[PDB]
Design a protein around this ligand. Sequence first.
Ligand SMILES: Nc1c(N2CCc3ccc(CNC(=O)c4nc5sc6c(c5c(=O)[nH]4)CCS(=O)(=O)C6)cc3C2)c(=O)c1=O
Ligand SMILES: [Ca+2]
Ligand SMILES: [Ca+2]
Ligand SMILES: [Zn+2]
Ligand SMILES: [Zn+2]
Length: 163
Amino acid sequence: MLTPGNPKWERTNLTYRIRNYTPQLSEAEVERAIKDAFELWSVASPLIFTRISQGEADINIAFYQRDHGDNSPFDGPNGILAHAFQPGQGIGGDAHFDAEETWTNTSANYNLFLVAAHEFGHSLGLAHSSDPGALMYPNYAFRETSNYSLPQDDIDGIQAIYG
Ligand SMILES: Nc1c(N2CCc3ccc(CNC(=O)c4nc5sc6c(c5c(=O)[nH]4)CCS(=O)(=O)C6)cc3C2)c(=O)c1=O
Ligand SMILES: [Ca+2]
Ligand SMILES: [Ca+2]
Ligand SMILES: [Zn+2]
Ligand SMILES: [Zn+2]
């Protein structure tokens, strides 16, 4: 469940910055989605995520449309929802979300919190899992639950890299 080449962060204290927002949600709603997404991984590893509002962070977060400078363009409604780069400097670890998607905080397509949590796995060095119940499973499908926490397969994956 590790990204090929075993690329990992050499530090456990990471910073992130939300570069822009989506008009479909309030700023407060986007911030809460991102915060909870990171909290999923933090409670199962030594990783600490610190938000900054200016300057250069380790993980940049932004909403872009079509061609946006990294040679991996988005494609309008549905299809590619977002993507993130493996651990590293520069664009490494950054996560981009397709601005043409309907972003929600409900079970309707597409829940920001869920897509983000998945993307951050890639930002930390995790590959896709073959376990249909894992956050890192290749296919998106929202499941309403009484309590939202990181599945055991994802826990094993994050621990196998950072302990
Ligand atoms: N495939 C593609 C994309 N997505 C990105 C976002 C994304 C997000 C999630 C998945 C697979 N996982 C789920 O659909 C999913 N995982 C979990 S873990 C978990 C839950 C879920 C879940 O509901 N869905 C809910 C209950 S919980 O107690 O909080 C624990 C796959 C994908 C693949 C693209 O973009 C693309 O092209
Ligand atoms: Ca898309
Ligand atoms: Ca970066
Ligand atoms: Zn991109
Ligand atoms: Zn993925």
